[PDB]
Predict the structure of Acetyltransferase.
Amino acid sequence: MYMKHIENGTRIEGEYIKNKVIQYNMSILTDEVKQPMEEVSLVVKNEEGKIFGGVTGTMYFYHLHIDFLWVDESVRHDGYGSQLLHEIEGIAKEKGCRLILLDSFSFQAPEFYKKHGYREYGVVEDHPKGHSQHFFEKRL
Amino acid sequence: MYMKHIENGTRIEGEYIKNKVIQYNMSILTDEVKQPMEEVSLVVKNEEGKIFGGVTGTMYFYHLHIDFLWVDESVRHDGYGSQLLHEIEGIAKEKGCRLILLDSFSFQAPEFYKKHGYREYGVVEDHPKGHSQHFFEKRL
């Protein structure tokens, strides 16, 4: 620690650490896994353009990570969730994704993903307190 | 007269989906787990601003997720990484965090975390192609 000190980093110091990690990762990985990074989004709309559902994800390394999937509560049993999942999966295959990764807390219907062919490869117990987190994967 | 269809969403719409999901989550969870979200980062540097190492993470649900940890290669033996990890865990422990989550690809030294008391709870084999991703946890 001579002539050095540890302290809280600033926002740019923070993005600097991130950029360095990304930089190292990419120096190791070769072109075969370097899919152009993309963010995809789908929504279910009303005739009036009203939205009661949607799903968003990010693609890279030739895999799709589903970040968020929503369906308005008033229509939760109407099956829009499955449609959205099928649709984005189709997009993922067309882009060359080899798999899909996502996680779901116990209060976000992990069973819904199981019904769609996702396999649980990991679980984080009592997180948040009184609940649990489930990690899923589906090979395409 | 009441039909709804699915279409690609815009970035703003993707952000809306995300917020509707967060809103719903919050609506079904107790305040007990509602730790106000917060980003945290530590850097090892000198007066001029050269960054020799750093770590960044985000807290919520009373847990710390380590997003990035980097140490300059010129000083990869000096143990700044272990120092940063230990230091940020303490900050997490101090803010009421009960758990720490992080993942590490095979090309990002996962044995580093294994050596530091982290338990691998899941693994995504062959991702990206030719590598693997290891998910770790440490209970505080």
